[PDB]
Amino acid sequence: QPAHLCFRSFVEALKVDNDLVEINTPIDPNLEAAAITRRVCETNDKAPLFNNLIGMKNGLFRILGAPGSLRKSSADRYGRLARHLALPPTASMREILDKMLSASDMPPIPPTIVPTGPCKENSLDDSEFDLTELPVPLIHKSDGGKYIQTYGMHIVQSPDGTWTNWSIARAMVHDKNHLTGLVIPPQHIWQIHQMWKKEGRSDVPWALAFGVPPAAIMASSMPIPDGVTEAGYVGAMTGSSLELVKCDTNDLYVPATSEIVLEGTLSISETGPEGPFGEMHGYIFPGDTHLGAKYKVNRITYRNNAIMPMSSCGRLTDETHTMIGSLAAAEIRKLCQQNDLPITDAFAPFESQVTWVALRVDTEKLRAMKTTSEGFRKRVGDVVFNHKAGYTIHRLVLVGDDIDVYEGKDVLWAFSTRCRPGMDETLFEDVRGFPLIPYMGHGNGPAHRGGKVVSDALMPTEYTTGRNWEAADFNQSYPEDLKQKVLDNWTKMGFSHHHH
Template structure:
């Protein structure tokens, strides 16, 4: 968990970002826009200190701290305050040895020193959350100089190896983004019942379960609603890592990927029911961004896919799902379930 603080000490950011060991005193890593770590680094550059930004890197911090450091909380909000609000008590902290940053007191290890935006080193390649290592590909990234290390006796180094689902980048970041997405829907007055980022989609899809009665009350069209949803999410930090938002009706269990993919392939017409957003910021780690010409512009490649039948925007639209649970009378379903073992099945 990286810790940076603005020069005026009003905003302290705890964040998760990858880092690569260069030698025994240096680390290089991603410090990219619009992430908060970059915003704080830029605030130091603005006062002429782009190469002497105090930092701390903490391993083995409290679970609540690592959770909140993964959340897309608002700009200017310090994660330590957010953690305290969730837990109902503050996280014990201690001061670093070489700078004024405060770090969780129960950390297993703490590295501290300075970050330079002007000194860089080739970083990568790295096996990221989307499941690829692109050989011989790296990028110049800012350089961290480690000036002190503190650690507990017999310290434990927590490790997460990202890649094909499922790992902590999907369960942690994806689930937390979905939680913030639901809150944003409530704040924005969207008729959204729930939100989820399915692990199988490598944290690139955001599924939104739409309340059909609420949708019909808006008296809107699929085009207008998709535009509204995309503008709300793709233009905020909540939607930064998301490249496709999928709207489904309230009969779909969005936590069941089998139901999600069924709705996706049967309820939208490719292109016709998808609204592209080519002017928003791309997520640079998405493979189809990093391996295309889009990596130069970092714009677009995002869309909202409407998997709600057009009729459902205006009125109830009855259909029967052709499966065992919903396609047969309840009495028959119960009878089969009650006699399952007698039929010779387990």
């Protein structure tokens, strides 16, 4: 099966790309695997595959770290994400995000049910496993638990059967047969949980699949619309119906090639201690345990020689930046366009710790709107900050057509030079806030409300008659012929490759 449709083939693709380091000597899941992975993420090194994990027994489990992190080279910077999607390894972020949005105006391609698959090669019932006996990583030294779940897909279905959601949400081992995890509004796992709670009759049938098809984990990380079954979206995006197999203990369906599957229930009544966890913004607050949702595990199935993917998240750059930020930005771009706003591109700059999204404006269309900064900022913020796709984003930066929003240096330049603090901004205090940002949940104000802003880095004439400056840069402040002459004579004169 293709790499974007089979995790085991994805691992092979990373090997072939010279983007994998296989570590065949013993590595401790208590911190060491995650420390190596952290170092990888901070230096854009090759992904580590831990083939000899202290505590692995009966095939459970190897670990792949940094599955969606960056490569060092500029030319294939996003190559791991491209390998999730069947794209060339040199694909740009625009091309990756366009691929992730492509299914949004296609008919879904529903999944195909098959009778078995690799994920059924081994099984452990309720009498045969103990989650505390598996080589679950301690990812950060102050974490409140061993976070088994950093890159698997939770599967839950609405009570009426019409919507099956796939999503990433963290979870840690609570005891031999339970996890605790985050289940928070407005996330779809929470929305579906609330449907079951209102019905009041049973716990939520649940499965958690690790090492799923890479294209599926990408959609799991993206805020596609309410009510949309990710499996059919991924089907449409990839042009192929995904092959799923039924769980043994419930009637949910998991990818046939999943490395590891947990089957059980998400409680509608029970909670347990959850966190703290070293999180996407770069912090852990030791001892901030809170009650989280509680999952009961009834069965484990797994591939021979199963591999657990792991995100050692925190400071730049890991999956929580490359995937959460970029995929939210993609959805926000679409949302703006569907609300008749003249946005061409959106990206969450890494420099912002993916708390900002820069929105590139088609300023020809803006001019035809005959509007003003105050009005336009309000319109944009109302659309984005009132929608789930905007949940994680606290600052929107509006920029004109000269800015490449995928280049953080240019976003920072535009923000710093074109947006007058205060006057060119609109604050939003009556919107949902993202509590995980330190200045929210550990800050001076309400954890769950406000703290958002639209920062207008459009210059005044961009609303009226057109750009009225040239940059004081090599590109814009010298004629073409002269620039070329300079470039052609650069090494002759004594001054100093794309792939590298």
